[PDB]
Amino acid sequence: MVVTRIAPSPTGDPHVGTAYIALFNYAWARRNGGRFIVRIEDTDRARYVPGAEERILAALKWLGLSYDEGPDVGGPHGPYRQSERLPLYQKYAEELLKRGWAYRAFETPEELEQIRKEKGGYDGRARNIPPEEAEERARRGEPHVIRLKVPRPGTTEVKDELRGVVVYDNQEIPDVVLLKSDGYPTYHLANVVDDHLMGVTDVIRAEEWLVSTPIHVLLYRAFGWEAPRFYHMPLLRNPDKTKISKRKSHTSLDWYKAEGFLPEALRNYLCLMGFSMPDGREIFTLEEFIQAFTWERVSLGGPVFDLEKLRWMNGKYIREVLSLEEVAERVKPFLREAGLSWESEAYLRRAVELMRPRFDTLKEFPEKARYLFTEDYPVSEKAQRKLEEGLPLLKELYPRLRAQEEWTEAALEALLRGFAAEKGVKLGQVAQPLRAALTGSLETPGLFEILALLGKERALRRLERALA
Ligand SMILES: N[C@@H](CCC(=O)O)C(=O)O
């Protein structure tokens, strides 16, 4: 049975790259009838951010990436936070020492810096300390790290399922620190001990880890454990092809959420990162992705995460995938956040229907349609100057609007049509000033549709304030 995992470090905002990796792990497990688990790698007590674990977990659920074992759901092979298994890494590091696969190294940082300058990296000189002397120095409390004792000379072969076999000369592999002087493990020791103990069979992780894999293969060999399959995902990129960064791309999943990106749309977009549908279809469900998933269609080029294409997809979901009523339910949290209320559901629905063709994110709806929910809307400068320029026409028009009995979109259009001809002007010269007066904007949906929406008295009662 296939077992995959996502292994986030709670050191910041939930990263979009974690969702990208999580998605493929979830998909590979589900397509195979297996399990997808969550392991929190939270040993960097220095970078630990309170609430960061919860936000990443919430973010995966927000996107529909349910997991089967984890810190909150529990599971048969926990604990699921590495901060809760510190004793296991120490004991496994001691086991490496006993097999001759690790050694204690006592160099101070000043020494390591001199050696790094002299040799280019740590040269393993502590391997020449008599083992009984190293044990005695450790026993007396001397500070030290436990390093991997790589076979010198030698070679190590690593198979990546998507990229093939790489043969490394052991000279390219340093005697990496496995256990730090504070008793905490390094990533190399913990990933191996935990993937093994949690039963992970398929390790799907970011490209950056690819070159660290021979260290891991050596560790599996050292413990006498069977290595899992390795799949290093193509690099997630900024539009300029550089490795995705917060300096040139929004990377926080909480940002996408707060901005009104629908989880289904963002999830669908992430599916297009390292994958393509056979027929080329770009809009599809999580289940369709799982049913279609195969490693044969994962491009290795490294996908560009494009905010423009994502906004386009969000828009397509808002006006072609969701129903009107569903879009209405979704903007509510955003209207509330903007401190706006709606008279009824019917009105709200109508307001969303009118605006639907004009917004690509849920947050843009309250921003662009504020004048529909509050009598105290903002008037842009550009709308104010158009309003001023056309005030006299509006002043003469006001009487016709008050006398207006038939308050329908079509009667109103005819009124203004009749009025402009009367005044010898084009309809637009009357229309735009009026739009500015009723909405504080020059860009809104159908002027006559809006005019009739609120209602005669409401509409009229708002036009008077423009004449002050
Ligand atoms: N905790 C690591 C991931 C480790 C792995 O995927 O093997 C990170 O946040 O980069």
Domain ranges of the chain: 1-70+187-237, 71-186, 238-322, 323-370, 371-468
Contacts of 197 by beta carbon, 8 Å cutoff, 6+ apart: 77, 88
CA 457 to each of CA 30, 74, 405, 453, 463: distance values in angstroms, whole numbers, following the listed order = 58, 60, 11, 11, 10
* 115/117 Cα distance (integer angstroms): 5
The neighbour count for residue 239, using CB atoms within 10 Å, is 14
Do 162 and 207 contact (CB within 8 A), yes or no? no
Do 118 and 125 contact (CB within 8 A), yes or no? no
* End-to-end Cα, the chain, rounded Å: 75
**Closest to 206 measured CA to CA, from 302, 281, 129, 133:** 302
Q: Which two three-digit tokens encode residue 252?
A: 């926080």
CA dihedral 156, 160, 164, 167 (to 10 degrees): -10
Q: Which atom of ligand 1 is nearest to the CA of 6?
A: 6
Q: Which two three-digit tokens encode residue 97?
A: 């020492």
Query: What's the half-sphere exposure (Cβ side, CA atoms, 13 Å) at 393?
Result: 24
CA dihedral 45, 46, 52, 57 (to 10 degrees): -40
Q: Is any ligand 1 atom within 6 A of the Cβ of residue 7?
A: yes
CA 288 to each of CA 284, 293, 383, 440: distance values in angstroms, whole numbers, following the listed order = 6, 8, 47, 44
CATH of 71-186, one of 3.30.70.80, 3.30.1360.200, 3.90.800.10, 3.40.50.2000: 3.90.800.10
Q: Which two three-digit tokens encode residue 355?
A: 């605006």
According to DSSP, the residues that pair with 165 across neighbouring strands are: 159
Q: Is any ligand 1 atom within 6 A of the Cβ of residue 8?
A: yes
Q: What is the DSSP letter of 7?
A: -
Q: Which two three-digit tokens encode residue 55?
A: 């936000």
Q: Is any ligand 1 atom within 6 A of the Cβ of residue 191?
A: yes
The neighbour count for residue 140, using CB atoms within 10 Å, is 7
Residue showing tokens 């004009």: 358
Q: Is any ligand 1 atom within 6 A of the Cβ of residue 42?
A: no
Ligand 1 pocket test target in 36, 55, 160, 191 with most atoms within 8 Å of CB: 191
**Per-state percent for the chain, helix, strand, coil, to nearest 5:** 50, 10, 35
What are the phi and psi torsion angles at 169 (to 5°)? Answer: -80, 135
CA-atom Rg of the chain in angstroms: 31
Residues marked active site are found at 246
According to DSSP, the residues that pair with 404 across neighbouring strands are: none
Q: Which two three-digit tokens encode residue 70?
A: 């984890």
Resolution (A): 2.0
Q: Is any ligand 1 atom within 6 A of the Cβ of residue 71?
A: no
What are the phi and psi torsion angles at 345 (to 5°)? Answer: -75, -40
Amino acid at 293: F
What are the phi and psi torsion angles at 402 (to 5°)? Answer: -65, -40
Q: Which two three-digit tokens encode residue 136?
A: 């005695």
Q: In what order do the strands lie in the sheet with 102-105?
A: 102-105, 145-148, 177-179
Longest dimension (CA), the chain: 107
**Closest to 143 measured CA to CA, from 181, 174, 172:** 181
Strands (E), 69-176: 102-105, 145-148, 155-160, 164-169
Q: Is any ligand 1 atom within 6 A of the Cβ of residue 41?
A: yes
Please report, in range form, the residues annotated as the binding site for ATP. Answer: 15, 208, 236, 243-247
Q: Is any ligand 1 atom within 6 A of the Cβ of residue 22?
A: no
What's the CA-to-centroid distance between 228 and ligand 1, angstroms? 16
* 139/257 Cα distance (integer angstroms): 52
List of long-range contacts for 156-159, beta carbons under 8 Å, 24+ apart:
156/214, 156/217, 156/218, 157/217, 158/213, 158/214, 158/217, 158/230, 159/229, 159/230
DSSP codes joined into one string, 36-87: EEE-B----TTT--TTHHHHHHHHHHHTT---SBBTTTB-TT---BGGG-HH
CATH of 371-468, one of 3.30.565.10, 1.10.10.10, 3.30.2010.30, 1.10.10.350: 1.10.10.350
Q: Is any ligand 1 atom within 6 A of the Cβ of residue 43?
A: no
Q: Which atom of ligand 1 is nearest to the CA of 15?
A: 9
What's the CA-to-centroid distance between 205 and ligand 1, angstroms? 7
Hey, is 160 helix, strand or coil?
A: strand
* 264/230 Cα distance (integer angstroms): 28
The structure's method of determination equals X-ray
CA 124 to each of CA 112, 169, 222: distance values in angstroms, whole numbers, following the listed order = 11, 16, 18
Ligand 1 pocket test target in 209, 219, 229, 233 with most atoms within 8 Å of CB: 209
Contacts of 324 by beta carbon, 8 Å cutoff, 6+ apart: 349, 352, 353, 356
Q: Which two three-digit tokens encode residue 194?
A: 């935990």
- Length of the chain, please? 468
Question: What is the second-level CATH architecture of the domain 1-70+187-237?
Answer: 3-Layer(aba) Sandwich (3.40)
Q: Which atom of ligand 1 is nearest to the CA of 191?
A: 7
Q: Which two three-digit tokens encode residue 292?
A: 């279609």
The neighbour count for residue 32, using CB atoms within 10 Å, is 16
Sort strands 145-148 and 177-179 into parallel, antiparallel or unpaired: antiparallel
According to DSSP, the residues that pair with 164 across neighbouring strands are: 160
CATH of 238-322, one of 3.40.50.300, 1.10.3720.10, 1.10.1160.10, 1.20.1250.20: 1.10.1160.10
**238-322 against 371-468: fold identical:** no
What's the CA-to-centroid distance between 191 and ligand 1, angstroms? 8
Do 144 and 177 contact (CB within 8 A), yes or no? no
List of long-range contacts for 169-174, beta carbons under 8 Å, 24+ apart:
172/214, 173/214, 173/215, 173/218, 174/121, 174/122, 174/150
Hey, is 261 helix, strand or coil?
A: coil
Ligand 1 pocket test target in 15, 41, 217 with most atoms within 8 Å of CB: 41
What's the CA-to-centroid distance between 151 and ligand 1, angstroms? 26
Please report, in range form, the residues annotated as the binding site. Answer: 5-7, 15, 41, 187-191, 205, 208, 236, 243-247
Residue with the smallest CA separation from ligand 1 atom 4 is 7
Amino acid at 251: T
What are the phi and psi torsion angles at 203 (to 5°)? Answer: -95, 110
Q: Which two three-digit tokens encode residue 199?
A: 């039963």
* 131/90 Cα distance (integer angstroms): 18
Domain 323-370 has CATH 3.90.25.10: no
Q: Which two three-digit tokens encode residue 442?
A: 């020059």
Q: In what order do the strands lie in the sheet with 164-169?
A: 164-169, 155-160, 229-233, 202-206
How many DSSP H helices and E strands does the chain contain?
19, 9
Do 186 and 148 contact (CB within 8 A), yes or no? no
* 366/369 Cα distance (integer angstroms): 5
Q: Which atom of ligand 1 is nearest to the CA of 206?
A: 6
